[PDB]
């Protein structure tokens, strides 16, 4: 009702996202796609992986409940009926900025084509431990040529909001967010409150997400606000069709959802040979 809007937006965002890099996996001749969906939460994405024609996906999240939920709703979707293919799926609970997911693999071997972090990188910046973690967890087992792809609130959008306020707060009808306060902002926990209308979320800047993703030898693909990549997207009719059938420009979104939703930016890495 109320971010239903908004949420659809997230939705098609993501799937363009995920569509086009799967695409290019498929063009450098790789047949069977495994993929790591890390933080995959209530499996929001379930069905955009099996419209992707998989054949493994591994959902993971800090949230046991989430995971078991998302796992229901994957027993559903393949307990349809005359239900085309659909990929063979592991569930794993666990902290990814804490925890090695290898540890937790059935398969311990396991490589993936992909590396899916929507809405999730953001948490793991409580701590440069946390951070590489998590980062390891996305990339340490991407074959050469993987990717690994996301969406995280931009934070150079996010301080310019700040330091424009008569507070350490910001916002509208729609969203709110609160830091612990302005002028300070570490490397790790930078911790600021965001309420959709509520967790406690970190600052990532970005150049040091770039760095950092090089330990595991990936570069950077591409780095682009959501207003960039909304822009770029919808030149192509698939993609605004799309977008209409799943029901600042004039534009789609009312200029408080614009607001709210030009926070984040979206980003690929590569993992290099
Ligand atoms: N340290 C951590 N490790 C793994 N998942 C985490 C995490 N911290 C938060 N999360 C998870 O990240 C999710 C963010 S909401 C994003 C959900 C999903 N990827 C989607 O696009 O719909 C939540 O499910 C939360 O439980």
Same mark, same amino acid.
């Given at each position: 009702? !109320? ?67 998302? #796992? ?7 307990? !349809? ?27 311990? #071997? ?19 431990? #946390? ?21 995280? +609130? ?5 301080? !310019?909001?700040? %330091? ?15 830091? #612990?306060?302005?002028?300070?902002? +570490? ?12 967790? +406690? ?26 207003? %960039? ?15 209409? !059938?799943?029901?600042? +420009?004039?534009?789609?979104?009312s200029k408080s959802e614009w607001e709210a939703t030009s926070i984040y930016l979206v980003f690929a890495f590569e993992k290099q040979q």
């Open positions: 009702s !109320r971010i239903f809007y908004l949420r659809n937006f997230n939705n098609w965002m993501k799937s363009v996202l995920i569509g086009e890099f799967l695409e290019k996996v498929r063009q450098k001749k790789k047949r069977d796609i495994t993929v790591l969906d890390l933080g995959c939460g209530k499996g929001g994405d379930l069905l955009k992986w099996k419209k992707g024609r998989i054949n493994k996906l591994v959902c993971t999240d800090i949230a046991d409940v989430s995971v078991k939920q998302c #796992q229901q709703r994957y027993e559903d979707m393949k307990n !349809r009926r005359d239900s085309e293919y659909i990929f063979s799926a592991e569930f794993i609970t666990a902290d990814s900025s804490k925890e090695l997911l290898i540890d937790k693999f059935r398969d311990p #071997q396991m490589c993936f084509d992909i590396c899916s972090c929507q809405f999730v990188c953001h948490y793991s910046f409580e701590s440069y431990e #946390q951070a590489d973690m998590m980062l390891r967890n996305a990339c340490e087992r991407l074959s050469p040529g993987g990717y690994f792809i996301g969406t995280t +609130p931009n934070s150079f959008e996010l301080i !310019r909001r700040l %330091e424009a306020s008569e507070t350490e707060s910001f916002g509208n009808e729609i969203y709110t967010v609160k830091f #612990q306060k302005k002028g300070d902002y +570490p490397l790790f926990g930078c911790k600021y409150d965001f309420n959709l209308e509520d967790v +406690p979320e970190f600052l990532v800047y970005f150049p040091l997400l770039n760095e950092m993703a090089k330990k595991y030898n990936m570069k950077l693909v591409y780095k682009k606000t959501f207003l %960039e990549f909304y822009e770029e997207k919808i030149k192509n009719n698939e993609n605004k069709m799309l977008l209409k !059938r799943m029901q600042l +420009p004039l534009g789609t979104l």
